[PDB]
Amino acid sequence: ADKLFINALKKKFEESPEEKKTTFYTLGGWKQSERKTEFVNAGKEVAAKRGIPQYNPDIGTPLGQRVLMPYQVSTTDTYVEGDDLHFVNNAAMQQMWDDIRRTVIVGLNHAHAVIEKRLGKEVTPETITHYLETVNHAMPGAAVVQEHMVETHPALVADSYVKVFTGNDEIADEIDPAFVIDINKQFPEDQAETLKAEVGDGIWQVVRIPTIVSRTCDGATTSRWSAMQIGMSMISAYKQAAGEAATGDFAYAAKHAEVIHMGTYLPVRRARGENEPGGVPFGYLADICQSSRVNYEDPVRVSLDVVATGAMLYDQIWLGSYMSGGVGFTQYATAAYTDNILDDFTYFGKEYVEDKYGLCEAPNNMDTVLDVATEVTFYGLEQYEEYPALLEDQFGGSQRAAVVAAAAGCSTAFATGNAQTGLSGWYLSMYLHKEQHSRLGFYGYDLQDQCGASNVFSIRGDEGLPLELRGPNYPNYAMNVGHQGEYAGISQAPHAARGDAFVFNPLVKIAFADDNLVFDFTNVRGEFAKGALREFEPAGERALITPA
Amino acid sequence: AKFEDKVDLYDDRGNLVEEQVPLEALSPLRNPAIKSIVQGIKRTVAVNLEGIENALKTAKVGGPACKIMGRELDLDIVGNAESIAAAAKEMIQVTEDDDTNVELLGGGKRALVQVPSARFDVAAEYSAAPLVTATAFVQAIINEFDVSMYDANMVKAAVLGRYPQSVEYMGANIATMLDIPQKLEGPGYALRNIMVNHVVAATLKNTLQAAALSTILEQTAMFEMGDAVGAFERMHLLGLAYQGMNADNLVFDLVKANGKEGTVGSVIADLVERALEDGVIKVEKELTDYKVYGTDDLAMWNAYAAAGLMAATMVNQGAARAAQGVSSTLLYYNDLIEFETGLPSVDFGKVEGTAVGFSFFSHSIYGGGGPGIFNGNHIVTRHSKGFAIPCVAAAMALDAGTQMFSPEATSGLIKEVFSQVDEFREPLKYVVEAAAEIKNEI
Amino acid sequence: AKFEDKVDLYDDRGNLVEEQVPLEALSPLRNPAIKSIVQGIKRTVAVNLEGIENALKTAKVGGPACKIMGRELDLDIVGNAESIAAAAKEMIQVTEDDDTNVELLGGGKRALVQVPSARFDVAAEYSAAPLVTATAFVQAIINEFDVSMYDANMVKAAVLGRYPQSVEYMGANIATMLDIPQKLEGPGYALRNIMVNHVVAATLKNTLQAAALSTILEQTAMFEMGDAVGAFERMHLLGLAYQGMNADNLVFDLVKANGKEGTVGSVIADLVERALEDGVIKVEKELTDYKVYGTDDLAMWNAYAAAGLMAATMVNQGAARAAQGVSSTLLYYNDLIEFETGLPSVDFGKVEGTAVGFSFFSHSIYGGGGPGIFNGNHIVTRHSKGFAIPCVAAAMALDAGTQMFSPEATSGLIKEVFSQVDEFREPLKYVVEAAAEIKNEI
Amino acid sequence: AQYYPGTTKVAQNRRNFCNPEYELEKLREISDEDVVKILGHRAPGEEYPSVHPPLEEMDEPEDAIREMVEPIDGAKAGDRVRYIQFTDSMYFAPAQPYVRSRAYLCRYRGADAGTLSGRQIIETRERDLEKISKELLETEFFDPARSGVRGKSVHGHSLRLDEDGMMFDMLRRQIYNKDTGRVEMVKNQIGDELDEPVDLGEPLDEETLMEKTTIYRVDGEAYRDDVEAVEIMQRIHVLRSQGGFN
Ligand SMILES: C[C@@H](OP(=O)(O)O)[C@H](NC(=O)CCCCCCS)C(=O)O
Ligand SMILES: C[C@@H](OP(=O)(O)O)[C@H](NC(=O)CCCCCCS)C(=O)O
Ligand SMILES: O=S(=O)(O)CCS
Ligand SMILES: [Mg+2]
């Protein structure tokens, strides 16, 4: 059959994808593009309205001396110019981040123990349901105790709410179902039994604060906002004095002793509080993506949907804005989720390992790393040499390094069932690619690449960690594009080949199995395409409180 | 001596030990037992070998609810604890005959580790204690079982947690009384970021010892912060002596006189009468049926009022056997004594202000928690320069079981290990003995 | 000694000082001159009395471009420097005639301050140096002129800046070579957050002494971070001795052979020949017209390769008398030596990886800057465990004036005060003398 | 020195570019003035600007390393540090990005070299940069169709070639004349128009690019078939891996 990227290449260029020559300079520059023409026109309108020059195609060098390409969003039939995948221009990408930033997981286990021991009161499915009706009024910013309170407009905060989950089916049955993330409905039977065993009789809240508040403020607001309104709803639903010594134990539990933040705080050179992208470990990003519970008979689809989630968040929004900004890093990320290119390479690797070893059957050792990562690295590089249009599409070396090494690393982990040997395969792919083509990425691309082999199996203080615990603050990874989202995919890969329900934290996996989110985490690449087409409806807008 | 003052020193049963000790013999700058406690705090680590083994066997590493399926490793660490600890000790020590200590507890489930003082004299700060301890135990476990290169990173995750993706050792199975340097609210604060429940656990809930350990740590931080330099030094030293060391048996005698039936107000009346009897205050002016008191020695007035504040805590929270009201005692002991006298309260209003915010943040939705989870580096309780937190430690020592976040809930690993160390558990004894020893060198 | 190795020690002119000294006589944990340098940098502060006076007379306090109109105070601080310094010394010291130093420089415009060592043996960390210095000078200035209660807070602002509203001492007119504990990228990193330009200023641009001071600070930090514990300790010590201390005259002799006409590639060929001559590496296999080298001592191969890497920086950046290309030398010395031999480069690839990001962050828009503004705590250059930063210090010492952010620009107050201290300025002299003095005690 | 393992023509070419005792094949002659024009840092006739005074006018104190390391002539004079940058096509250009930086630090003194996928750069003192740049431009480091001198807007290393066999250049600095079969540089490396174009010779023919190339490809020599070069890269992977562990 055709390689999986052939249809996209045939859409981009008039030539067949094998052809070695083309003609340039005759497309009229920016005038070849619908989207650049929209931007030229809008720049002139902006600059006149405000009295300061702004977008002008004649400043600097003239874009479009070659074809400005469409991109196919992988797994879709949607083709868009790359500007429609820039996070500023894509409301689905912005919403994906807002839905992670505004979520926290908050136990009720300590809180129910303070109620039974210090207060001497009962907790039952009934009192939990009453509490959940109360906190679903309070959480978006409405009052339950004081007179003369002024409140948030419910329709500005319609995306904020609180659900619960538990491994105990007979409570999950007894609590009103509007408030419950039902594990048995959301997960196939084997994954549901794993997840229920991990949670056991614990009961956990999934709290989503309003997108408009997250956008006004920051990620470190989320667990505070959540705990204020859990605290008011525990006082209202359980009949406390409205502010007694026991009220402090609910605050400490909701803010510190039973909270799970999506990201941990950062060191001062990159100072940020909790629930910012740099604090989200790679294992959590794979568990936030919900492809694992829908596409479980296809470990390549599950792993590549995690790569798309992480390349967009960590390279476009995090490295390309929070840690830099400007035009940013759209296409360093799009290489990992367009034109079915990473998909072709990773399906080759999966077939190679299923035929040679069987998934999860290969020895977990350096012999397996050398075999699989070298075979898949040579396959992916051969495609750029056989298809000139593929090399002109992924024109930057860094884009090619990340795609070829992601396929090599994921394939290695599909063989071993262990993410650490998949990570060693990622670094070996970089070293082979650098020698094959006498180039790799941009000036700084392989800082982590050259520390990489030596730090995969180190045990020292700031070196040693399983890949699932690493993230954008692991020291070697803290600066550079074209790695972080691919590492999230390698973290997912052995767990998708094993059939595991989660990669690192089962509470995080269950917390995003929820159709009341704005973004659909079961189909991340489909959502990116809907946002690119201007068809996604985000939360957070101010239209209701601004003129027509 | 720079100061003429002398004090009499007692044991925790109210008996005189040493009379007429120059005030500077209790200074953290001079007293060698304060030096030994502070260096001990810097270099001591608790290792939970059972916890390490269970994290490995279940693959539950990297923080709450985290697990990596397929990474499980079943290692007989507690069954081979002696060999593992000896191998760690040979990497931790500098020489054969230094002051490194590695001691098994609980049948090998825990280890007390004291990293050699010498690694600190060539270090900027105190993080060598957990980081040298953690690597020596990770390497000793790998070497005991010949753990492979492919699996050894799970041992590291089980010992030190999610660090360095997290800034803290998130999920670690080692513990220290200090916390990481990045969490300081300001430079010089590290001896203040020691949870009140860890001081009460170390001292086995002995009220006077918990108050003395807390005061030695708070007032030694005042020197490191520069607060006890120049004009303020004598104030700080008299606070240490009278509020934390029971100087002159003042605290003890107030508690003895008010323990059966007294209140915060009855303690205040006795302390004002004692200050007057000693010549610390005198009537400056008569208003209408109201005496306005003055003092020619504000540092000494402050110290006597500080001893009364500690005694008032012990009477009020001791009577309830419930620590929560320490926030109230810290506020109203100071508010009442200023309208009783016309003189400024302890720390010139800063205890009262710390107590206002502490009361709010131990009875509200916004933050804080029970008394035991505060410390001198907590934003709510950093404001008084050593005169508030020791009272919170005395109150939690006196709590009979009212707290969910008790020292048994938050500090069990710290209790098992750090109460083994005699100068942590019983500091009042050692700092008194040392002050007597150097009394003629001041 | 734990290790069997010995080294020959030389001076900064390449002349033998002492033969066959045990390697551990250079260890930060044993060498008394490294202790004196780490304790000296913990306790030393530069005070800009002229800067304080100017901030007060203009009310320009609290950070760049800040001013409070109406708050000006015209005080003759420089004209009364002697009396102010003596008053501050009496507050800073612990006892008369202890190790406190307060010395005027620049006709009273500056002061070198060394806070007494005893204040640090009772502190968790090193912030007592700026904090005790700042408050002693603020109180001595208020006492010299009888500044009123209403105005004294301006003295405080002119000395220590916008702290504690800012976390740092933003706008202060005192300086240290260390930076605040909150800015550490991990626990144990404080001796790494020392700007390269500050080391080059304190050593007066003597290339071997700047490399020695940097290597001492970096490898001392590797002890405090636990990286030089157990399996890795000998690798770190050998790196200290051969890359930073010119052990066996190897860096000197490789520079002598390649200074006239040499390149990074000619230094590689000379170092591989010397490793083969000395038995550190041997031919393991022949491929087609290509010898594969192996070693039975990876830590010694790494130390020889590290010495070559320092000589290659001195030859390449010394030839250009321009520091920028140290990022390229640190990359391609390591890249070329792996394909020349089949053996791993310095720090097992971590110098090469540090150099790829350092090259990008010293020639791009995204961050970093010139070589002098980096340090072992910077996110771009923290990754190699001591083997990269000392070569940046050597390259900046050799720079003849190509940098805008030069040590004259960033480090003049550091230069004037810290270069007075003989052990900071000429540490290769003092640490070799101390190693020879302890050679039969190791 | 041995420089690089392997038994292909690519491997031997990589060794040749690194080896200072290999004579770079000179393919074309360029005048000193035309090298200054292509560089674009000063006008013919303009004196070298300085960034600092001459070293002789400095009087620096005693330092054994300074005394042993001879400064390059532009360092003695205090010249500014300037650059030259090249892009090499993946369709068989003779030099390639890491081959350049490895070779430059074997052959040239006082050199700051940077490697990226689409550009490779050297920075050194101005007068010494002019002498090195003449060798980079006249010898087999450079082909005028498959390599480009470009200080900005570098895109092209990974693009299909044009009808004339020329690499893409957004700024069209090198123009192939279809009537004459020669390439002329018509702008300097940052893209400003030159007063008169500089002849860079004829493109190398296909057989000569295959003789001289340093890129491995399936339609040339594939890296996977140079099994001794692959064995060394896998060996360095495994040795670095084990060394970081224990
Ligand atoms: C005290 C502290 O909370 P913790 O004790 O750390 O949970 C802190 N909150 C606050 O100061 C709340 C201030 C806003 C609400 C009370 C306003 S009066 C914080 O979240 O960092
Ligand atoms: C290096 C550091 O910059 P500074 O040297 O501190 O200015 C850091 N920036 C970055 O890491 C930039 C990363 C994103 C841009 C490059 C991506 S390859 C930061 O801003 O904190
Ligand atoms: O050219 S650089 O590597 O510095 C940056 C690439 S975005
Ligand atoms: Mg055609």
Ligand SMILES: [Mg+2]
């Ligand atoms: Mg939808």
Ligand SMILES: [Mg+2]
């Ligand atoms: Mg009475």
Ligand SMILES: [Mg+2]
């Ligand atoms: Mg009367």
Ligand SMILES: [Mg+2]
């Ligand atoms: Mg000699």
Ligand SMILES: [Mg+2]
């Ligand atoms: Mg030679």
Ligand SMILES: [Mg+2]
């Ligand atoms: Mg000529």
